[PDB]
């Protein structure tokens, strides 16, 4: 239609109206006003016949293309849409009500899609191109953006925006979802309250962050909890929480304060309990020190499918930090610091369940010896395709952290809960 | 209400009339006098009337806000306040008697809090800002300051001021609280006077630093004492003490002076006693050398929950130094260097107790063997919930360090205190 030709002509004319870095750094309102003025002047020059609403829509589209996120803007604004999927400039899918459906939306060119994706990832200081075709990030809004570049994605740039959900689950919801039996809920409450050094492992999308947010509710209000996280996602209810946020390197690459520096500083900030948002670098090492030297009860999320895998990953993480420790020293440090590893995994049917509560008991040569206080035993599938399982206690009577439970008077609750279900 | 509104109006008028550039480097007394005159003129013009004391207090508060530290200045002045913790401009906490308590000291806005933090850090010739958000400094007063800027501190800049307490506890206080029986006090006096290579290990918040500072009171004044400590907590009263502190590397990663380097240099100062504030890394190794190769009489704290746990920790930290020393060599070094390990722990009721005063009598069967001279035996909680315990002397008539006590002519005090405790 004539609208497309008019938009193309307006874009071509405006291309020389300002530098690429001029509007990107200027005020958004000023840039929008300038774009509106330029669009009106171009329309008047071309004598394009359109209504005032049509002119406003054209101006909005021009602004979105110049500095926005292009034809994604209608989809991003919508609330019913949970996921946006762009498999090339000509394929856009959206998830509504749990159903994925195709949309008439289509980007102008694969180059436009690549430009928009680069804009989105740079929004958080990350860059995607032929030298880094894969880029996964979490936007400030909380949505997660995953981008694959042309050289990997044959059909064009592949973009996945999982929009943020502001709702937060609670231990009541987890027990009602059967993610943890009531006895498991009480034992986890004891673990959180007794200042045990948690490590909330889990798999991609398995619910580690939500589990950690629900577990932190067991922290005594008087304690000073300090939160280090790559993106604001935890919501503690404690009156005395301190929220820190790792600053990614700028476009030039300066000003990079990694989470390791944040933890190293928290060591000198008088925190009662350090809560690392997600251990994804060498900070693990420092965190373990904070776990082992004061700051009892520090938690931390980790990406690993099994507690043994989590321990192996932590050891490899400490090794990768460049510190010249031997493997046995790292294993000894892990044994000393970590108290209990909670494993959250997503079952084959898509449901999420806490599979293991594995207390690290000690070391034997090159193998860390641990005992599973709680284990999820699967038994089959329901007629609707859902998995069926039960949380069973391994019958341990005096877990290593029992002393801590005794120290805080939570001995009775643990004693009754851990043996109520077996 | 009325006072707050009047102060706000007066401050606005002064800011509109006072040029901040002149007060940036002008004399404090002259600037204060000018501010007081301007405030009086504004009050006369603004129909502000109050008591002479109220007007003087308002003028002083305005002057402090303009140039001083602001609303937290009275807290800094107060001795009773041990630690100040301001996370966000609207939440302030103080440590009183070891208890964290919120206060109604609310800053006007996060901008004022950032300005006050910048003023605080300026004293040490350092700057904290968006470019350099993390700052750690030791003010001339001895109070440590840690500041985090907005881009990292999500809920506003954070400021932790750990003031240097002067009223350090003495052995008289410790015996007053029954933390150590008077016989235990005499044994500790003998241990500290006779230059024993002792390690004061303890649990979180147990009182290791206070115990070490009480132990240091027993050293002959003529002895040259060199203290290496990150936080500068110890306060000795001898006339020939040398105080050193480490340096954390700048965010660029250069300038670090680890405790290891400090101790390695202290080896070349002919010190009579090396007193490491807290052993936390490979520096332990060097200390052990300084403990056995001259400088006999060293001391050093360490975070561990039991004498055997402390020894294992020392082995681990020596191992993590990158040296090729096997387990046997390290254990032999520890046995030959250390004499007395003092374990202080906090009990269920929050009361500190010197749980153990043990020796390291030797190495047998490839494991280090200890010998408890003083132990704490608990007899269950009382009807009030307080733990009931007694200090029991094992009755060992000939401790390994006995000869040392004899060399200084204190053997009679040792034999009396150790036996009378039975
Ligand atoms: N037990 C649960 N029951 C139902 N929904 C859950 C459960 N745990 C998590 N969820 C939901 O699953 C989605 C992903 O969970 P969450 O955000 O906690 O992921 P995560 O484990 O932190 O992921 P990542 O590995 O990417 O950091 C969110 O909608 C969360 O609300
Ligand atoms: N034996 C004791 N009795 C009573 N209070 C103590 C004792 N030892 C330490 N404290 C208190 O504990 C507080 C902190 O102790 P601290 O020196 O930090 O021990 P550590 O350095 O081992 O954590 C001090 O303010 C002090 O008042
Ligand atoms: Mg997460
Ligand atoms: Mg200390």
Short mmCIF file of C-alpha atoms in Angstrom, two decimals, chain A residues 170-357:
data_model
loop_
_atom_site.label_atom_id
_atom_site.label_comp_id
_atom_site.label_asym_id
_atom_site.label_seq_id
_atom_site.Cartn_x
_atom_site.Cartn_y
_atom_site.Cartn_z
CA UNK A 170 5.29 -19.03 48.53
CA UNK A 171 5.94 -22.17 50.53
CA UNK A 172 2.16 -22.47 50.81
CA UNK A 173 1.91 -22.52 47.01
CA UNK A 174 4.81 -24.96 46.70
CA UNK A 175 3.23 -27.39 49.17
CA UNK A 176 -0.15 -26.97 47.48
CA UNK A 177 1.50 -27.65 44.11
CA UNK A 178 2.95 -30.79 45.76
CA UNK A 179 6.43 -29.51 44.89
CA UNK A 180 7.30 -30.38 48.51
CA UNK A 181 5.40 -32.39 51.09
CA UNK A 182 4.38 -30.61 54.31
CA UNK A 183 7.11 -32.44 56.22
CA UNK A 184 9.57 -31.27 53.58
CA UNK A 185 8.23 -27.74 53.98
CA UNK A 186 8.83 -27.84 57.74
CA UNK A 187 12.32 -29.28 57.30
CA UNK A 188 13.16 -26.55 54.80
CA UNK A 189 11.84 -23.96 57.24
CA UNK A 190 14.16 -25.37 59.89
CA UNK A 191 17.06 -25.34 57.41
CA UNK A 192 16.43 -21.71 56.53
CA UNK A 193 15.95 -20.54 60.11
CA UNK A 194 18.87 -22.49 61.60
CA UNK A 195 21.40 -20.54 59.47
CA UNK A 196 22.44 -23.56 57.44
CA UNK A 197 24.61 -22.75 54.43
CA UNK A 198 22.23 -23.47 51.56
CA UNK A 199 23.09 -24.09 47.94
CA UNK A 200 19.90 -24.07 45.87
CA UNK A 201 20.96 -26.03 42.81
CA UNK A 202 18.67 -26.86 39.91
CA UNK A 203 18.25 -26.96 36.16
CA UNK A 204 17.49 -24.32 33.57
CA UNK A 205 13.98 -23.12 34.30
CA UNK A 206 13.71 -25.51 37.26
CA UNK A 207 12.79 -22.74 39.70
CA UNK A 208 16.01 -22.05 41.61
CA UNK A 209 15.33 -18.33 41.98
CA UNK A 210 11.73 -18.80 43.10
CA UNK A 211 12.80 -21.51 45.54
CA UNK A 212 15.46 -19.20 46.98
CA UNK A 213 12.96 -16.35 47.28
CA UNK A 214 10.56 -18.64 49.14
CA UNK A 215 13.33 -19.97 51.39
CA UNK A 216 14.61 -16.53 52.37
CA UNK A 217 11.26 -15.88 54.06
CA UNK A 218 12.51 -18.10 56.91
CA UNK A 219 15.32 -15.67 57.78
CA UNK A 220 14.89 -13.88 61.08
CA UNK A 221 13.98 -10.20 60.51
CA UNK A 222 16.76 -8.97 62.79
CA UNK A 223 19.49 -10.45 60.59
CA UNK A 224 21.25 -8.30 57.99
CA UNK A 225 20.86 -10.14 54.68
CA UNK A 226 22.83 -8.79 51.72
CA UNK A 227 21.70 -9.76 48.22
CA UNK A 228 24.07 -9.89 45.24
CA UNK A 229 22.38 -10.57 41.92
CA UNK A 230 22.92 -9.92 38.23
CA UNK A 231 19.35 -8.63 37.91
CA UNK A 232 16.74 -7.54 40.44
CA UNK A 233 14.56 -10.63 40.90
CA UNK A 234 14.48 -11.50 44.63
CA UNK A 235 11.90 -9.89 46.93
CA UNK A 236 12.79 -10.47 50.58
CA UNK A 237 10.32 -9.31 53.22
CA UNK A 238 12.97 -8.73 55.89
CA UNK A 239 13.20 -5.16 57.22
CA UNK A 240 17.00 -5.15 56.99
CA UNK A 241 17.81 -6.44 53.51
CA UNK A 242 20.44 -4.81 51.31
CA UNK A 243 20.01 -5.26 47.55
CA UNK A 244 23.11 -5.13 45.36
CA UNK A 245 23.20 -5.51 41.58
CA UNK A 246 26.22 -6.45 39.49
CA UNK A 247 27.02 -3.74 36.96
CA UNK A 248 27.90 -5.22 33.54
CA UNK A 249 30.79 -3.79 31.52
CA UNK A 250 29.89 -0.73 29.47
CA UNK A 251 29.99 -0.74 25.68
CA UNK A 252 33.69 0.13 25.85
CA UNK A 253 34.08 -2.56 28.52
CA UNK A 254 35.04 -0.40 31.52
CA UNK A 255 33.28 -0.11 34.86
CA UNK A 256 32.88 -3.89 35.11
CA UNK A 257 32.17 -4.79 38.74
CA UNK A 258 31.62 -8.54 38.63
CA UNK A 259 29.70 -10.36 41.34
CA UNK A 260 33.01 -11.58 42.75
CA UNK A 261 33.90 -8.00 43.68
CA UNK A 262 30.42 -7.52 45.13
CA UNK A 263 30.82 -10.55 47.40
CA UNK A 264 34.37 -9.55 48.32
CA UNK A 265 33.02 -6.18 49.41
CA UNK A 266 30.06 -7.69 51.26
CA UNK A 267 32.65 -9.55 53.31
CA UNK A 268 33.59 -6.09 54.65
CA UNK A 269 30.05 -4.76 55.11
CA UNK A 270 29.00 -6.57 58.30
CA UNK A 271 26.38 -8.87 56.74
CA UNK A 272 24.68 -11.46 58.91
CA UNK A 273 23.89 -13.58 55.84
CA UNK A 274 25.08 -13.21 52.25
CA UNK A 275 22.58 -14.38 49.62
CA UNK A 276 24.19 -14.61 46.18
CA UNK A 277 21.55 -14.36 43.48
CA UNK A 278 23.14 -16.95 41.20
CA UNK A 279 26.68 -18.33 41.39
CA UNK A 280 27.86 -18.11 37.77
CA UNK A 281 31.53 -17.13 38.09
CA UNK A 282 34.52 -17.53 40.40
CA UNK A 283 32.68 -15.66 43.17
CA UNK A 284 31.81 -19.16 44.41
CA UNK A 285 35.22 -19.31 46.07
CA UNK A 286 34.76 -16.06 47.96
CA UNK A 287 31.19 -17.01 48.86
CA UNK A 288 32.43 -20.23 50.44
CA UNK A 289 34.80 -18.21 52.62
CA UNK A 290 31.84 -16.11 53.70
CA UNK A 291 29.98 -19.35 54.34
CA UNK A 292 32.84 -20.81 56.38
CA UNK A 293 34.21 -17.73 58.20
CA UNK A 294 31.25 -16.08 59.88
CA UNK A 295 28.15 -15.05 57.97
CA UNK A 296 26.62 -18.42 58.80
CA UNK A 297 23.55 -19.18 56.74
CA UNK A 298 24.61 -17.68 53.42
CA UNK A 299 22.63 -19.08 50.49
CA UNK A 300 23.32 -19.19 46.78
CA UNK A 301 21.67 -20.41 43.61
CA UNK A 302 23.59 -22.64 41.21
CA UNK A 303 22.92 -24.29 37.86
CA UNK A 304 23.23 -28.07 38.17
CA UNK A 305 20.90 -31.01 37.69
CA UNK A 306 22.08 -33.15 40.63
CA UNK A 307 23.75 -32.40 43.98
CA UNK A 308 26.83 -34.34 42.89
CA UNK A 309 26.85 -32.34 39.66
CA UNK A 310 26.45 -29.16 41.70
CA UNK A 311 29.46 -30.05 43.86
CA UNK A 312 31.55 -30.89 40.80
CA UNK A 313 30.55 -27.61 39.17
CA UNK A 314 31.46 -25.66 42.32
CA UNK A 315 34.87 -27.31 42.42
CA UNK A 316 35.48 -26.55 38.74
CA UNK A 317 34.26 -23.00 39.37
CA UNK A 318 36.73 -22.41 42.19
CA UNK A 319 39.47 -23.91 40.02
CA UNK A 320 38.60 -21.62 37.11
CA UNK A 321 38.93 -18.56 39.36
CA UNK A 322 42.70 -18.66 38.92
CA UNK A 323 43.43 -19.26 42.59
CA UNK A 324 46.26 -21.75 42.88
CA UNK A 325 44.55 -24.23 45.17
CA UNK A 326 44.80 -28.02 44.78
CA UNK A 327 41.70 -30.08 44.13
CA UNK A 328 41.74 -31.62 47.61
CA UNK A 329 41.84 -28.16 49.19
CA UNK A 330 38.81 -27.10 47.14
CA UNK A 331 36.93 -30.23 48.18
CA UNK A 332 37.80 -29.59 51.83
CA UNK A 333 36.57 -26.01 51.53
CA UNK A 334 33.31 -27.15 49.92
CA UNK A 335 32.78 -29.72 52.67
CA UNK A 336 33.45 -27.17 55.39
CA UNK A 337 31.29 -24.38 53.97
CA UNK A 338 28.23 -25.94 52.34
CA UNK A 339 25.72 -27.49 54.74
CA UNK A 340 22.79 -28.67 52.59
CA UNK A 341 22.18 -28.64 48.84
CA UNK A 342 18.56 -28.33 47.72
CA UNK A 343 17.89 -29.68 44.23
CA UNK A 344 14.99 -28.23 42.25
CA UNK A 345 14.28 -29.86 38.90
CA UNK A 346 11.54 -29.81 36.28
CA UNK A 347 10.00 -33.22 35.69
CA UNK A 348 9.45 -34.72 32.26
CA UNK A 349 5.84 -33.46 32.21
CA UNK A 350 6.86 -29.82 32.69
CA UNK A 351 5.99 -29.68 36.39
CA UNK A 352 8.60 -28.53 38.90
CA UNK A 353 9.49 -30.56 41.98
CA UNK A 354 12.18 -30.40 44.66
CA UNK A 355 14.02 -33.67 44.16
CA UNK A 356 16.84 -33.77 46.73
CA UNK A 357 17.72 -32.23 50.08
#
